[PDB]
């Protein structure tokens, strides 16, 4: 059936307890929802972020930094998160598929995503990475050669550059796996940031949503699934103008966008990615909803289109 | 041509400088040798160990251990090394292929290898992991609930259980990739140690040689390449009996074996793996030589056979 690229959130995987067990445990539930789509005859093309995971790992790299045990640069850290999270997800999916009696194979592929070295993002570190720190701790680490930004309500986090995806090196192999009916997990953590023909690794963390967006293109998927904690995109939330979006046209999204309805932090990137995907090919669509909502399915939430 | 499973050593990748750069740099040279085999029309099925890489990572896990940033258990650590080392190797191969004008695709697949929970290895930690420590530091860490073993000449290292491979979960996917002429990198770090139908992760590190041996079986490769720092196996080295084996029979190796010639720490596993492979199928062969020697090629060193 429909080829769907689902982008799992790293902050969702690690929304509370930061222990491997807790994260794997969380992935069991998400896998249950994913397998549900498989029961419906859809083709799953899974991806995932790594925000908190990579930050914690980066800290671990710094904690023992020495000649004998040197810290692995961010690009290499992303690769490690592809391994860890990949492992967890794949194990979870297998468990759920096995239980559901469905016999599909799952494979995670290390993905190197090319980016433009002249990307403005390299000047503007924005990707919130790791745990929340007090302004005090933020200062303590800030002077070590790092930039932090505040999230009103919980604290400060280290910000990193998030360049836009230009090309997915392993795209061909991924596509081949898809053609052989294998559930693929790729573009882990937005993909290992790489630049140039030599694919020189750079220090950054790409946004899962935009990486998934490119994958959807190169893979010619039918739908791009952007995850959110709530089903339906709300506008003017606490205000008396509260409205769900349900069925929307790209033009309609642009209207709301121009009217500053989407927060630059989370919602804006979601909308932009959605719009970009739909505008890439004639018969394509983007969906924005809760994974739990997909676990139910019938007539789903937020469908961005133009045709 | 011949399908060859080559097992790269983690200690070879990290033989000196422990920095990501130094290791990647080392992988460029190895990639050159590997690409040479491709020029000869051979099919490459690459694998690799992670001994030093995983130990350093494990230490990093311990250095920041806390509720907010907990240590990832060994199984998850192996997964991370599959990601890091995989990334490095894939990147390097790409570079060398591109340079050599050869257009082949390279893909690393996260591999979960099944083992027997009742394996004697779980009682006998043997796999040397991480850096060399003085007996003093060994004692300091030993009482933390860890076992260490000495290597006369350089120091002590933390030992971990090395259960034998029973099955490779992603074998089917790997084989598919091979049939599509894609250079696969799998069984990273001997593979993520897993147990049972549920694939419950266990704390251990599988030997690359034995993992590659299983891969060779399930993949039906023509030859298993076991790497050594030297071309040709030399029994009675510095003695007046120094002899090269060149071409040998399993029986002959078993005879040389009984005489306790091959050191249990390195050479013994090499020989055992080779013998086991050749004895699995009628027209199979195992090779033991330097990667640099393969980089030359013609009439290669140490060919174990029986047919």
Swiss-Prot record, chains A, B:
Specify the pathway.
Answer: Metabolic intermediate metabolism; carbamoyl phosphate degradation; CO(2) and NH(3) from carbamoyl phosphate: step 1/1
What reactions does this protein catalyze?
Answer: hydrogencarbonate + NH4(+) + ATP = carbamoyl phosphate + ADP + H2O + H(+)
The answer, when asked if Nucleotide-binding is one of the entry's keywords, is yes
Known consequence of changing residue 135 to A? Answer: No change in activity
Top-rank EC class of the record's enzyme: transferase
For this protein, the activity regulation entry reads: Inhibited by adenosine(5')pentaphospho(5')adenosine (Ap5A), Ap6A and to a much lower extent by Ap4A.
Q: Indicate where this protein resides in the cell.
A: Cytoplasm
Record protein name field: Carbamate kinase 1
Q: To which species is this protein native? A: Enterococcus faecium
